[PDB]
Each structure stands twice: as C-alpha cells, then as structure tokens.
C-alpha cells in the first residue's frame, strides 16, 4: 500500500522527504476533499499518559473527521493501564489487543519507540515523548509553511526563543534540513541558544545559519518567523526579565516585515506574542493550529488505510 501504510511515526528522523511531502500532499487532498468515513469502523486509542489538552483535542477531532471511533485516557495520577505500576510494555501489550492504532503522549523520551516493540501489528503514532520528538507537530508546521509559501526550499526561516530546549524547534530544523537552500536565522539568549548538535548538522548538510540577538536584525529578510515559548521556569525571574525583550513580538516590530511573512508559534503564546499581532495578516498561529487537523488526519489515513485513493 502507500509508503506509510501500517508504518510508525516515532521520529522526524525516521521520515524522508518523499515521506513528508507524501503526508503534506495527502493533508491537502483531505482539506479540499474530505472523506468522513475513511476510518469508519476503526477504533483508535488516544493514550495521553502525559496531559496535553490541545493535542489530544486536535488528534481526536482528526480521528472523528474520518469517522473513526476513540478511546483513551489522560494524566492519571497513577499511570493508566495495568493500574498499579505495571510496566509501559504490559500496557501497550494489552491496549494493542483492543485497538487499530495508538496515539500516545508520554513524559519519558523514547516512550513511543518502546511501545512500538510491543503494539504487535498495531500502528503507534508518537504525539510526544519527553523532550525527544513530537512529529505530528512538525508535520502541521511544515504543512503550514508549504501552504503559505508555496514551497519548502530556499526559505529564509527565523526561529526565536527557547531554541535550546524546544523540541518542536529542533525537529522543524531537522525536517527543513531535508530540503534545499534553506537559510536559518536564530534569535535567542545564549543561555537558551540553539544546541551545537544541530548547528553541527546544518554545518554538514551545507546549510546557511546565523545567530541574532534581535528580531529586527532580520525581520527584513524573513518569510517565516517561528516563535517559541520560553518556559518561564527555564530561568531565574530577574534573568528572564532582562532577556524578555530579545524574544517578544508586537505589531510595530512588523513595519519592515515582508508581504509573505507568516508568524508561527506552536502555542501557547501569551508571554511572547502581543495580542495586537493577532489582527495583522502575518499572524498565522491559529491558522497553524487549524492545520494540525489535516496533518493528523493525513497521518492516520495513510497509516490505517491500505490503498489510500489519494
């Protein structure tokens, strides 16, 4: 069947560029011409060992937009399934006897991959495992970039904020590092700078990246400005205050912003994006959250549907 049929989406590194394009393409098909009964009769497990309301709501809505059934759980005080401290494996080992696919979020890195070695024949889609991956998020981000820029090559992409810890950031960067001509601009406080491991990877693939302490330094040249949330705990308050400006957008900072620039943000935005940015044509964080529905739909469609028509 299709390339991704019955495959597992654990990392944005186990995916190729054909793969990705394949996902975005399908995600566009479904957006234009929806198939509400494509997974009619399939039952999906929305297992959120770790709480994430916005992703769970999204994924489940993508699950009901294809007519599939849903069962699952959330942040149980005491790990869900087994109900006593039994192993994650014994957990997946069972749910896999009940479902047709598993979407899970776990606070431990490598949780989706381990489940994978137990789901039997059951496809497991990783929604987030500790500070490791979160593929579906990158897919909707790429789908949101490719839709509004018409492409994913030779792009001036600036990334602002907690570049050091944000998993979506490291991931989008690696994905865009699958296409050509991309130019990166990174704006964050050196205490939260983009890991070397990534700049080292960009160095190899021959990609151009530069460091900037201010948004207005490149606002001039950017297509997409992808902001992150500097988890307020990552820093000592007074430290935070003094670096705060480095990473916050307002409408006035937009004056010399290109016509095509969209401002993305994985959310929540609340301490990074002033609300006045909202009504500008660049703002696209909500349109972005909107596309997680078509990305997650595309992902499920491919994986659970053999000869995916389109």
């Amino acid at each position: 069947a299709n390339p991704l049929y019955q495959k597992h989406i654990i990392s944005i590194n186990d995916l190729s560029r054909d793969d990705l394009n394949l996902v975005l393409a399908t995600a566009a098909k479904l957006k234009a011409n929806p198939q509400p009964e494509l997974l009619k009769h399939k039952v999906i497990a929305s297992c959120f060992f770790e709480a994430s309301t916005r992703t769970r709501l999204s994924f489940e809505t993508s699950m009901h937009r294809l007519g599939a059934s849903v069962v699952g759980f959330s942040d149980s005080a005491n790990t869900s399934l087994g109900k006593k401290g039994e192993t994650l494996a014994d957990t997946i080992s069972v749910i896999s006897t009940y479902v047709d696919a598993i979407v899970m979020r776990h606070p431990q890195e490598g949780a989706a991959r381990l489940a994978t070695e137990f789901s039997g024949n059951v496809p497991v889609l990783n929604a987030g495992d500790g500070s490791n991956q979160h593929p579906t998020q990158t897919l909707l981000d790429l789908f949101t970039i490719q839709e509004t820029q018409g492409r994913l090559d030779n792009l001036h992409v600036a990334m602002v904020g907690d570049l050091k810890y944000g998993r979506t950031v490291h991931s989008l960067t690696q994905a865009l590092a699958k296409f050509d001509g991309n130019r990166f601009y990174f704006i964050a406080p050196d205490a939260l700078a983009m890991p070397q491991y990534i700049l080292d990877m960009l160095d190899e693939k021959g990609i151009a990246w530069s460091l900037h302490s201010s948004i207005e330094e490149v606002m001039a040249e950017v297509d997409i400005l992808y902001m992150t949330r500097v988890q307020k705990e990552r820093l000592d308050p007074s430290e935070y205050a003094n670096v705060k400006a480095q990473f916050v957008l307002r409408a006035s900072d937009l004056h010399n912003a290109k016509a095509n620039m969209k401002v993305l943000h994985p959310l929540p935005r609340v301490d990074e994006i002033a609300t006045d940015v909202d009504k500008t044509p660049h703002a696209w964080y909500f349109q972005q959250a909107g596309n997680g529905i078509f990305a997650r739909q595309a992902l499920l469609a491919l994986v659970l549907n053999r000869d995916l028509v389109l």
Binding site: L88, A89, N132
Partner: protein, 152 residues
C-alpha cells in the same frame, strides 16, 4: 612468548581473548556473561607484557566468536586480539575494530529515558566524534560521549 616461562601452557583450536588491559578482564566475563558456559574455561589476570606490562586474558577452550563479537569487545578491549587459533598454531589473528551498535551492556545515562524501568535491552549508535566515540540511545535518541555512558 610469555606463557612458556612458568608454563600455564597454551591449548589447541579455539578462541583465546588475549592482550586485554588488566582490570578489564573481570568486566568482559561479567558484561558478556562469559563464564556462563561449560567448555574448559580458564582465566588469568594481572600478567606480564611490555608497553602494557600487565594484562588480563580469558581462554575459551574450543568454541568460536562472531566477527562482530570480536567487535563488541572493541569498546572495552581496543588493543587486544582474539586468537582464531587452529590447534596450538596461532593461525587467524582477529583484531576487534570499533563496533557500530552496542546492545545490552550499556546503560542510558539519561535518567528519564524509557529504557530504565522497562524490559528492553539498551542499544546505541556508535560514531567516533572528535574520535571520542558518541553513542546514541536507540530510545531517547540522545547522544553522549562513550566516556559518559561507560562511567556507570
């Protein structure tokens, strides 16, 4: 060559791990559970040499190793060589070059990695960064320096 001084006397066809650095011979017996077997197993450590001076040296009487097993040892016993000896005549000297995949004997230094509590065996993606070998956790996908994983 050395064992013919105070005659511990070498033996025929088989595999004899030799040129292990002392204090790193109990390890391999342990790590690779080598004493789990029955074939004439003899062990000698803190021996004599030259630039090394000492050395551990296991002897697994008649029974061979894979080309890779020859390698897994590569992270612990670099300068050393397994003897593909065919009856007293040391003929077939295999020198373990760094392996690309380590499984089971390594511990993910990531206290948050899924591997720890669960019934899976570790496994890392070897690579020689700055040449100081950077191992990647099959699970958390995090990369540490072989000298961080090994410590404990």
């Amino acid at each position: 060559t050395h064992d013919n001084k105070l005659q511990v006397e070498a033996i025929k066809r088989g595999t004899v791990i030799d040129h292990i650095p002392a204090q790193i011979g109990f390890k391999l017996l342990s790590l690779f559970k080598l004493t789990e077997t029955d074939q004439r197993i003899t062990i000698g450590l803190n021996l004599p040499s030259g630039e090394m001076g000492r050395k551990d040296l296991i002897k697994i009487e008649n029974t061979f190793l894979s080309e890779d097993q020859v390698d897994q040892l590569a992270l612990y016993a670099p300068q050393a060589t397994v003897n593909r000896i065919d009856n007293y005549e040391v003929v077939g000297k295999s020198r373990p070059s760094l392996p690309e995949r380590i499984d089971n004997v390594l511990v993910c230094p990531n206290s948050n990695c899924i591997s720890h509590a669960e019934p899976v065996s570790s496994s890392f993606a070897v690579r020689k960064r700055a040449n100081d070998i950077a191992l990647k956790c099959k699970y958390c996908e995090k990369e540490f320096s072989h000298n961080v994983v090994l410590a404990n």
